């Protein structure tokens, strides 16, 4: 299912740049956070949902660090050369 999400991410990433459709790809991934919103239980099979939520948090951090040269956080610049509004300030 994560590979299916990766192929869906490549389908959105065929054309996604500079929040013209990079914002569309991040919005499709933020609604594709139903991996976190389908199964979430204790005494499950050992934090695979936590790994998936870590990868989705990396996707959301890439969304905030992309879409308008603003802040980064990791000094990453993972966004190379190419609207949930969760971070309204740099601090």
């Amino acid at each position: 299912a994560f590979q299916l999400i990766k192929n869906f991410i490549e389908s959105i990433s065929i054309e996604y740049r500079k929040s013209v459709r990079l914002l569309e790809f991040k919005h499709y991934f933020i609604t594709s956070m139903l991996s976190y919103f389908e199964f979430e239980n204790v005494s499950n099979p050992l934090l695979c949902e936590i790994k998936a939520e870590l990868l989705m948090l990396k996707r959301d951090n890439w969304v905030q660090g992309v879409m308008a040269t603003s802040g980064y956080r990791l000094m990453d610049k993972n966004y190379p050369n190419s609207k949930e509004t969760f971070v309204d300030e740099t601090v």
Binding site: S13, C48, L55, P80
Partner: protein, 150 residues
């Protein structure tokens, strides 16, 4: 068609060389991201019940990952404990299966290059210094420097 780094780890979980192409003549300090991506894959050997290996005949191209701008995987041959990995930049990625078997076969070419330089007795006790430069000098033409061949 171009890897974003080349990483080499033996069976003692000691990285042999985390080689990055073009760190001189071009952008620096993303090598500091590259080796910690390699260490993320190093302690991400097997975690959260995800199994890469089911065929024991030949070790083929195992499970793809994607993390913060790159696309990494692993190719554990299980022969002499070699644990070598290759990432690719996601920004130029077509995601096909001849791409997938193409990076499988060029993973076997870099396997061939390591096993050729592993037993070159023209210089003996090449195990600490300029073995690394020599293998880098055999790395840096198989994926790049094709610009003048024609």
């Amino acid at each position: 068609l171009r890897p974003c780094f080349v990483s080499l780890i033996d069976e003692s979980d000691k990285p042999i060389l985390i080689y990055v192409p073009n760190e001189a003549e071009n952008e620096m300090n993303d090598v500091l991201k590259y080796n910690v991506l390699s260490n993320i894959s190093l302690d991400y050997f097997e975690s959260a019940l995800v199994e890469w290996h089911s065929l024991d005949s030949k070790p083929l191209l195992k499970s793809i990952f994607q993390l913060e701008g790159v696309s990494v995987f692993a190719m554990l041959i299980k022969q002499t404990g070699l644990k070598i990995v290759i990432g690719f930049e996601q920004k130029s990625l077509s995601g096909a299966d001849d791409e997938f078997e193409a990076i499988n076969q060029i993973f076997e070419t870099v396997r061939k290059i390591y096993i050729r330089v592993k037993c070159n007795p023209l210089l003996v006790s090449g195990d600490e210094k300029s073995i690394i430069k020599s293998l880098e000098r055999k790395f840096d033409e198989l994926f790049i420097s094709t610009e003048v061949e024609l």
